[PDB]
Every structure is written in C-alpha cells, then in structure tokens.
Amino acid sequence: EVQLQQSGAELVRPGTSVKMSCKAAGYTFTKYWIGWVKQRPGHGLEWIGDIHPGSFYSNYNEKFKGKATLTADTSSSTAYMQLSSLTSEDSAIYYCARDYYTNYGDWGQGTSVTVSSAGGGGSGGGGSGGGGSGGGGSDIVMTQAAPSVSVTPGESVSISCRSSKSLLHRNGNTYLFWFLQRPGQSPQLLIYRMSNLASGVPDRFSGSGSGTAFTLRISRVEAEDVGVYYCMQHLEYPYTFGSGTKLELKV
C-alpha cells in the first residue's frame, strides 16, 4: 500500500526552527504532488502548500510565505517542510498527504510541533524559501455553518458546507472533498469530487451539491463516525478548508 512516514514530535523554544520529514513508500515519488496541512486546535485544518518532487515546482498559501519552506529529496523518496522562527501560533500537528488526481487520500501520521519556553533548540536555520501561489486575487472561502452536531446512534445526519464561488470545473467535475478526522487519527478522505465515495469508506456516506452548496449525508451514524468533518476545495490555489463540524453521539 502507499505509506507516508513522518518524523518525530518536536518540543522547541520560541524563535527556533524545525525541519520535518515525510518518507514516501508504495508509489512513484516523482509523479505525485505532496501537500502539507496544519492542524492547530481551535483552528481546524489549514492548507500550507504543495510540491512536485519530479520538477521541484512548489506552491504556497501566502499566509505561510516566510513561515514554511517545502523541499524534496528524490535519493531517499523524502519530502521536507521547514518551519522558521517559531511562535506559539505554530504549535500544531503538521500532515503530509499525497495528491492522487486531486484526492488527498494518503496521509502521514502527522508531526506534532509544540512551541514552549521549556523546549529545545530546534533543527537550526536552513533554506528559508518561497514558491507560491494562486493568481493573487481572492481565496475561496469555505463555510461550514454548524461547528457541531449531535445525533442519536443509528439515526442519520446532514453536514453542510458552501463555497464562495462555484467549484464546478469546465471538465464537468466539482472539486469538493469531505474529510473526517477521528480522535488521535490523521484526516481520512470520505468523498472526492463532490459525490464519489473513497475506497474503504462505508456507503453510509453520501456527498451531493449544487456547485456552491454541499451536503455530506451520514446515514445510520455509528460510533466510528465520531470526529470532525471538514469540506475542502481543490479547484484553485490556495486550497481551502471549511472550519469543521464536530459530530458527537447522544448515546
């Protein structure tokens, strides 16, 4: 199978830097883009940027310009992210993910970064970098109106999202994705291109939409469905996520 193995947790002082690794197995490293995602408590999921290990082209969310630098080493099939000049806002779990024809289906286990006065000296300085971006106009705002939803087990629920512009491409596909992040797990892809069920996801999950409004319908909710559901658009850089809807059981 595809595996992405990320490096160990960091506990570091304000003002330091870290360099974390993501080692790829199970597919051709130079063929697929790798994206990076920041999961900060209270702040959902946030897209950092991507890199093509074949061409070394990279694209960044402008919010991370001067913060994150992406590289890849094809000799060891490893992708890297360096975070410079760390502050308490950088404390989060950082994920790598393989982009398979726009589907972020394969995720690393995450690298925890915690910034604290009691921490260490970090990895040391490095190639602080750059590479973006989208066209430089407005980012697509993804809105999830409900921060949480409570359901009786075995009953069904809708999770809603909307985009500030249409996610319909001229190829006829709608570049809307749903993810679930369970406690202590990496995000899992549920539905890709609005309505396609990801491999190994129960067909209790269904995706639908208009183009600007979307519904993840979860039929007959089970305990394993508990977690935070995120929508995401993969139409144009920078990729953007909704703020997340926490599903809890009313047992």
């Binding site: 883009w33 074949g54 694209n59 596909n173």
Partner: peptide, 8 residues
Amino acid sequence: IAYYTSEP
C-alpha cells in the same frame, strides 16, 4: 499529472 500545478 502536470508537473507545474496540482490544480485540475
């Protein structure tokens, strides 16, 4: 997959 963007 294009080497110059991941965007569809």
